[PDB]
Give the backbone structure.
Amino acid sequence: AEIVLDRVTKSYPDVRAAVKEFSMTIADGEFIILVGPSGCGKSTTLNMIAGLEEITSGELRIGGERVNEKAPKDRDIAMVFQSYALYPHMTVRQNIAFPLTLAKVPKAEIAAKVEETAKILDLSELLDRKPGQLSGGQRQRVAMGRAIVRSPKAFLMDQPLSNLDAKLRVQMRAEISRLQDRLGTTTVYVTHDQTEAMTLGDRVVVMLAGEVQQIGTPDELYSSPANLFVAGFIGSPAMNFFPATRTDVGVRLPFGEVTLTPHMLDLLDKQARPENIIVGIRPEHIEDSALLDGYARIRALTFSVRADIVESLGADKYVHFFIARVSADSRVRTGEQIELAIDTTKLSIFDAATGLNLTRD
Amino acid sequence: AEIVLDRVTKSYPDVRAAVKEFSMTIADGEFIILVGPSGCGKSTTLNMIAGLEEITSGELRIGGERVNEKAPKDRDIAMVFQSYALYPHMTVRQNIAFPLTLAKVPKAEIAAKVEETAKILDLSELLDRKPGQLSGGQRQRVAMGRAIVRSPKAFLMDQPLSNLDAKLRVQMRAEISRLQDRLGTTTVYVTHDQTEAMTLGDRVVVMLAGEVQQIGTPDELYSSPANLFVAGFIGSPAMNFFPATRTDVGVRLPFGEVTLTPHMLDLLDKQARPENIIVGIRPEHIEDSALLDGYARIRALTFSVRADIVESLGADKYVHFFIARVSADSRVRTGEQIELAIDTTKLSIFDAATGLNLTRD
Amino acid sequence: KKSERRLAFWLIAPAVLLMLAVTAYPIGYAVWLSLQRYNLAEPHDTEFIGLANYVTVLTDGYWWTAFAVTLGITVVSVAIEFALGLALALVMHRTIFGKGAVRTAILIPYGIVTVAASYSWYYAWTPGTGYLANLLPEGSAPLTDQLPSLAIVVLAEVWKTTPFMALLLLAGLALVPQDLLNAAQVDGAGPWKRLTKVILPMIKPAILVALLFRTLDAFRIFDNIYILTGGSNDTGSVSILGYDNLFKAFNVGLGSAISVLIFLSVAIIAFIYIKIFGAAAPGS
Amino acid sequence: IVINYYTPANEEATFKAVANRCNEQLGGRFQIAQRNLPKGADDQRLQLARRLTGNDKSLDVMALDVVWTAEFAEAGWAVPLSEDPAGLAEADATENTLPGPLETARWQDELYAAPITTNTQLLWYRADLMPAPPTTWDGMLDEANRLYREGGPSWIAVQGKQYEGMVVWFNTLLQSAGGQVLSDDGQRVTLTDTPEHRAATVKALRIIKSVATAPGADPSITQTDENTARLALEQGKAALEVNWPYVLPSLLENAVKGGVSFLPLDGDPALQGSINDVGTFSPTDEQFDIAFDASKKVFGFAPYPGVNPDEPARVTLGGLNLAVASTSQHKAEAFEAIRCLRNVENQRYTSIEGGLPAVRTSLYDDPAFQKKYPQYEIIRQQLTNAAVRPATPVYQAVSTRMSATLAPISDIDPERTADELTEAVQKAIDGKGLIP
Amino acid sequence: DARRATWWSVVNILVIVYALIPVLWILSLSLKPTSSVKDGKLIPTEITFANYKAIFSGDAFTSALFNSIGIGLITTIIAVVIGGMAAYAVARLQFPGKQLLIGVALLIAMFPHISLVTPIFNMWRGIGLFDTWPGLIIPYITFALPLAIYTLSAFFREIPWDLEKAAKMDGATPAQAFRKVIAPLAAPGIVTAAILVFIFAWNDLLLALSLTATQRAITAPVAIANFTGSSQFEEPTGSIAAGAMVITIPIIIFVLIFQRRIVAG
Ligand SMILES: Nc1ncnc2c1ncn2[C@@H]1O[C@H](COP(=O)(O)OP(=O)(O)OP(=O)(O)O)[C@@H](O)[C@H]1O
Ligand SMILES: Nc1ncnc2c1ncn2[C@@H]1O[C@H](COP(=O)(O)OP(=O)(O)OP(=O)(O)O)[C@@H](O)[C@H]1O
Ligand SMILES: OC[C@H]1O[C@H](O[C@H]2O[C@H](CO)[C@@H](O)[C@H](O)[C@H]2O)[C@H](O)[C@@H](O)[C@@H]1O
């Protein structure tokens, strides 16, 4: 089934909002990401999806029913919940047998279900200890399979790879995707980390302060941030914003002036004449002017600002000045003077008096 | 002061060496990263570094003084615990004034130094909420608060940034470096985040099974991993590896052959001739053969493989099939056919029977 | 290391030394008095008894019925005080009201002087005067009859016994972070089944140690039954029987034997709650 | 020096009143500290036995209920009165005494405890609820059945509880029926030795069983004492009772503040300010008279009721004797106290205005005394056939063993239960088996 | 949900009145006039202080109260100070047989005191002593300590020693500033234990009968257990009730204010 958060909102006494009517839908068998800062409401939303937090206002609908108040058994959905809980005073195996025991299956069927289940998610080689013997990452992967086995109407999953190294994390990410594919089941992972999000979601929702900031595909959000917040949130290192001003040809910058593409000029002229602009640019587009061909010299502004420091990270020289992220192919050194190059095609415009992406489709 | 571990091991009846006789001098005011997988005795090494633990074999000297079993208060150091224990039953200002009060400064001077610390460490504004009223990352940053007011001769710390967004975390790391610079402090951090490791370490110590796999710069370890294991450990995604066979001129590969550069054949002739080799390829060494300049067309091996998976990362495609980190200028997609290109200079080789780096300087 | 073992023993030394002195030598003396044939009216002529002190007691129906009535009272009081105390702990935990009110409500009946409780119930059940007796149909005579009187004294002692073990079980759930219960009713929604089939596993020594103790506390009874009856309706407690032989008749030979076999009669159930059910200490 | 004296709780107020009255005389020689023991007889006996055998040096003097002297003398606890440093306390004893209380003071060989008060059971009835009381157990049942059939205060208030007051009531029946518990030398049971003894006992057992099983009886009669008896009559639930004199000042004093619903007293203008502070009734002569004459038409009294209607009942006695604490570090002054407290200036007070009969014979010859204590005639004539107790060091065990087998009072087999009694007392004479 | 909130509200109000009704019956009985006490009605009409005045007048209660509070306080401190010296060994440390050391400690408070009554009378507790504060204190301590240890053990498991490791980083000295934070850490456990054990100890009746002697060395439980009205001629009940209310309330109003740290414990 599809799920639908129609204006769903939460307020609690210190009354104050934890969610200011954030709104969404998840299509049948879709994979979503939610992402946002700590305390931005996601823990609310999953408690609200469970029908266990009080939905203070709005309308959760699923499968043709309004369901804001329905208990988890009535909902027929599960959480791969952040606390990575599976039972002490019990076996590892019995923690994964608990849902199966609620499902009260035939014992041979149960042993087969466990056998596939524990060939999956296999954080111990079916070690089947008392779980307090195992490592926290192993427990996390165990709690993962432990929730995973039931194939409910939907799944929610809570930044689980944070408990793990990145190598095994991406392996578990791929496994997790293959699982959701094989399940074809309505799904959301949740994180604070956009690097996880951009690979995992068919469509990401982003929050700040109990409100949705945008919804779309990962490359929609990357191509077309809805506001200066999500433009600052996306990418790594994050988008450079520099103080800039309008010109009839395009823009004026801290170190020069640039022509704007005709369609962006047309939209900028359908828009107001703002006093201040954040030019949004991904720092990785910036290069040493020594590296350019003639086509790039046509397409790019080049200008000089001191490399006040130069870190280098194998991919880039992280040129501090602010940051300017040239390829490490440029042999520029810490504290040097340099001429930077940037493709004039790539600059996003934000009106710095409002934070709206003036360049956005 | 300089510090000097040599043959230093911790052993427990199980008999089992938790640290297998490690060795390193660390210069006065140097910054170090310890790194390895989890279960690599890191938690052991913390106690041993502090002289809280017992040097079951080997020796530790600092400033030329023997300190093997000399308890932490003997050494004029400070430290932060991975799960960030900090003084309960007192609020923030009281808790961080306390070790400064053991350092027995005048009360006004202690409060002034702590007030500076509240701006400097800046884990929050100065709330003075009760210890449990704050969240875990803030406690961690408050335990860093405890470390900054100590202004010691030396430091040791474990994964604080893991509790935080990586930008605020890397900012905190840079603020920490400015501290270590200003305080000229003999310093180690332990870090599984290879990015934050590489940007902080003057020198990394790499460990597996409680033994030193290498000591060097991040650029050395990136350029020249000591063996096939540590070549898999360094960076993200890890180096690709292929079983490939020596030719009289270089190597015959699963997808072609490359003439090894004469300067490197010389080393391959100072070495034995292994029949089979784990040839290592940097994922970022691999590109779409249509994107190339004339020298790359000339010099590269180029060969065709199905792009079974194409992960999209904005700046790159992680073409998985093995993982080629091609640039995103290639428009190639999941399950398409493509010709991949590789720079011979970005290869490495390890003898398949032993994992020793044949391409090592 | 010998040093830190030695300092641990030095910290124990005063407590264990006097703890031996105040019990072991008294007990050794008590069994020696059970070897003795003695009366306090004629203490000097104390020959040995040929196990006869024990032989009298194990021969005696009054002893056996006094034993049996305490077994009856103890098991049922255990059962009900547990059954109640479990719910009491859960409501004292999960009430939406100001929890200091329920915390106040439960502590006072735990704290009140047991004798005063004994009197209050005794008067409540005195016919005509006692409102609880007075409301019945006439000729019921609640104090006159064994099973009614027994039932009443159980129904009296609960208002002192269960509030303590409900507090014990409250700490017995303070050791459980409530988010674990939340994690249990995630998936396992339906808290009648959920809260039982989690608390059943979850309460390892939280409840166990709260069963054997209350049980021996009950077996230690020497009060409410006594003031309620003097042992009449044949409602004699083994405690009252011990007192009766001693202060009414001064046969220390019998009374010491009774004392020590009562000490055996705790030792067996304590041993059961070591050898059986696991029943290890909470630090195990 | 000061001297600790232990009273019964049920009658301590009187003792502290005279303790004040003698302490003011005694002044700088010594003073007496009144102290106290429980209301229940065996309880005050065992509490004291604990106090004694705990070897306390500070308790100085006691009043034992006499039936507790044989065992004490057998135990060498207290002394034969000849051991007195003064001696002539044994010659304040004798003197004016009645002989029955002195018979109580004398053990095998010596006298051991100076007699100081005595009782024997009076019959009581509401003279306003009936004329002419039945004087008989049979007539008692029949008239109680009258009141029950009339829906009146049908209850009969005999002391039913498993403590020795019940055994005493029983013993008064047994000896009134002409039976006795043992050989006179207390060496072997006699209550069923002969069919005449069986008959005498089993008659009393039928009486006991027919009592309380009568319809309209007090349901909780099975646990009662003298106070609950008195109170139940004052509460108009009973109309008949068999007890002692204190009852009168208890009625009088209660009525003067409340008491009987059927007689105001406290509303009477003559009775205003009659009772002193410390609650005591303390009447003027006329306040006594008016309370008395008002009570006389309400509550009547009589000699104890007969098993044989033609035969005067062998009513059982009780009382107290004083004794020196054998632990006391000083004791000539304890005999000096014993003398001045046995003295008539105390004795007369303790009967007239303490309500408890003093054993000094000449007191009844005062018309002032006689007038304030008219039951004295009934007492005096009850003395001369009074039923004694078996008088042995084993008496507490014997009596309690009896009380235990007696416990199913309404429910005994009158025949078989006599065998049970004989076997129980046989083991009690043997000094064997547990106190139940 | 308002339905479930009514279901809460009713169980909340019913359970408190269930707890309270015995004391209402007691108190009301002590206020009701002599005439009215026999009435089956709970209604406290026409109230009188006379019983309470008759308790306050004369030292009968107040002496044995002063006995009781002293013996309670002193028995508390000596039990917990010995307790707190030992609790570290079992619940911060390890030593051979420590599991059996707690294995007996959990038992040896909870004895049937009747077994232990007779030997102490026949020893120097009733012989070498009897009418003495030590004579009654020693058995109280015998039952206090194993509770103090048992309870303190729980109140020591709840604290990880990891903070003391950080403490030896900020300064390695034994006791001193380490005591000056470990004692602040431990203190809430100390007072929770001191409360419960005081109340328990104050709650005895058996030895409080069977060895106590006179208004010097008799406790208030024993006093009310044998007290029988200040007038022989009134029914004792109204006085008995007034005294009972008077003696049970003061500890109640003390501990209920102090509930916080024991409800934490
Ligand atoms: N009992 C409560 N009273 C008041 N406010 C509450 C209560 N419970 C939750 N909240 C609100 O919810 C928020 C905490 O939940 P939230 O998920 O936003 O934080 P979080 O757990 O850090 O989220 P995440 O970890 O997913 O970033 C708080 O900002 C608070 O205002
Ligand atoms: N008492 C002991 N007995 C046996 N081994 C011990 C003991 N104390 C410590 N060790 C050894 O020390 C190690 C403690 O963990 P380790 O040093 O691997 O850090 P870790 O916590 O596993 O790493 P991470 O910080 O990544 O979780 C164990 O591998 C164990 O072998
Ligand atoms: O005469 C006043 C005394 O009456 C009670 O004692 C008598 O009555 C008891 C039966 O209940 C007898 O056992 C006892 O022998 C009698 O002396 C009362 O127990 C005493 O306290 C009174 O002083």
Observations:
- Residues 120-303 of chain D form a domain with the D-Maltodextrin-Binding Protein; domain 2 fold (CATH 3.40.190.10).
- The pocket of adenosine-5'-triphosphate (ligand 1) is lined by residues A 12-13, 16, 18, 38-44 (CB under 6 Å).
